[PDB]
């Protein structure tokens with residue numbers, strides 16, 4: 001018998017999918033899949049001091 | 051000899067305040083005195099007469 005525990009919607013961590021990466025496009029209506037975070041919008045250069 | 055201080059933690063509710071650069075500047079405990087409970091309900095640091 002094999003058991004396994006999962007956890008979702010947390011800090012971006014490892015143990016993820018095998019999908020290939022792509023490039024970045026800005027100022028264009030596009031879909032994104034940034035390490036689990038999913039949505040659509042327009043990506044632009046920010047200036048927030050993280 | 052040396053010197054060191056020790057405290058202990060408890061489950062509480064705080065009202066953290068972020069500045070325009072994303073750094074915590076002030077906080078208010080919500081179970082310290084009657085005045086502090088008013089601030090948490092109003093979600094403001096300034097209370098008008100009433």
Ligand SMILES: *[C@@H]1O[C@H](CO)[C@@H](O)[C@H](O)[C@H]1NC(C)=O
Pocket residue numbers: 049069070071
């Ligand atoms: C926020 O950061 C900018 C640039 O680092 C600085 O000019 C400004 O004074 C900061 N504001 C603060 C510390 O309240």
